[PDB]
Design a protein around this ligand. Structure first.
Ligand SMILES: [Mg+2]
Ligand SMILES: [Mg+2]
Length: 339
């Protein structure tokens, strides 16, 4: 498959996960039969699904990259704040709304300040930086630039390293998925390598120690994913216990990656009629918790990996602004990849 199919698939997958997952967000239990009924409703017998903050911020991030043909922190921060101002009720986290209001002050010349000051200067460690970051890996092909600009784009709202390292990890997963066919072993090894390096930086250790986390929350979790994948038939309760299904970036980004890797293979509980991308989204939502955001992240990775051949027409055409998303993906390709 060509890279254009992967770019289109990436942003479609992210849109599908947000749209299809939104109904269940914050539900502590999501029966698989309920999710299957939900997706079956997208293929009725012959309203759109609305997107949430995850897509609104992903679109603003991509708009900024297209406009400036590069990461531009001021342009992107203002676009985030203005998008919230225009359409505030999309399901944003309570934490980021405080940053947006501060960014809307003309006297705010340092666009990193509002995020940095949150939580008594510790910053947010939620997954808002990661939920929107896929476009960075479409604009920047080098693994060094992916890390650099995933970090900076995340720091506009999520200044804790526990937040921005989650955004880096997610961006790296999308970056690797763009490379195509891989064993789960190889995929994980490459990600583990990066996180072991990044979690040794001083800020990383300091933030984790301040949080009592016996540290390396991402590296430890990537190791756990390898162990989970080795198990014959792991329960959702174990997956949630070991990895999480939460708003914290370390309780959602590894989980998304697990769902991607796990769902490469068939699941006897999920009808064989569903392809791997559909399976990934169905399973991720069935973990409950922060379902739109875990699914939007798993969907970005799966869409980059499987490309448009696994993006279901029925689901996609059910999603608010799917044509807009697709033309934005094409435009990222033209601006950043075609040359
Ligand atoms: Mg959302
Ligand atoms: Mg969410």
């Amino acid at each position: 498959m060509a890279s254009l199919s992967r770019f289109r698939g990436c942003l479609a997958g992210a849109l599908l996960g947000d749209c299809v997952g939104s109904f269940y967000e914050a539900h502590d239990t999501v029966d698989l039969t309920s999710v299957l009924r939900h997706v079956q409703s997208l293929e009725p017998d012959p309203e759109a699904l609305y997107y949430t903050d995850d897509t609104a911020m992903a679109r603003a991030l991509v708009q900024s990259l297209l406009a400036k043909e590069a990461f531009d922190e001021v342009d992107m921060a203002h676009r985030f704040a203005q998008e919230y101002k225009k359409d505030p009720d999309r399901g944003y986290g309570a934490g980021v709304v405080t940053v947006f209001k501060k960014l809307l002050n003309p006297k705010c010349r340092d666009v990193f300040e509002p995020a940095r000051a949150q939580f008594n200067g510790k910053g947010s460690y939620g997954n808002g930086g990661a939920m929107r970051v896929a476009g960075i890996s479409l604009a920047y092909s080098s693994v060094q630039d992916v890390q650099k600009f995933a970090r900076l784009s995340a720091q506009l709202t999520h200044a804790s390293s526990l937040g921005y390292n989650g955004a880096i990890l997610q961006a790296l997963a999308v970056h690797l998925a763009l490379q195509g066919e891989s064993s789960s072993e190889h995929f994980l090894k490459q990600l583990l390598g990066h996180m072991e390096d990044l979690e040794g930086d001083a800020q990383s250790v300091l933030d984790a120690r301040e949080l009592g986390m016996e540290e390396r929350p991402y590296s430890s979790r990537l190791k756990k994913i390898g162990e989970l994948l080795d198990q014959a038939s792991v329960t959702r309760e174990e997956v949630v216990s070991e990895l999480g299904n939460g708003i914290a970036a370390f309780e959602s980004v590894p989980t998304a990656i697990y769902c991607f890797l796990r769902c490469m293979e068939p699941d006897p509980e999920i009808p064989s009629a569903f392809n791997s991308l559909q399976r990934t989204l169905i399973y991720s939502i069935s973990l409950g918790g922060d379902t739109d955001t875990i699914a939007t992240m798993a969907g970005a990775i799966a869409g980059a990996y499987y490309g448009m051949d696994q993006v279901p027409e029925s689901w996609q055409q059910s999603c608010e602004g799917y044509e807009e998303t697709d033309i934005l993906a094409q435009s990222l390709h033209r601006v950043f990849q075609k040359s």
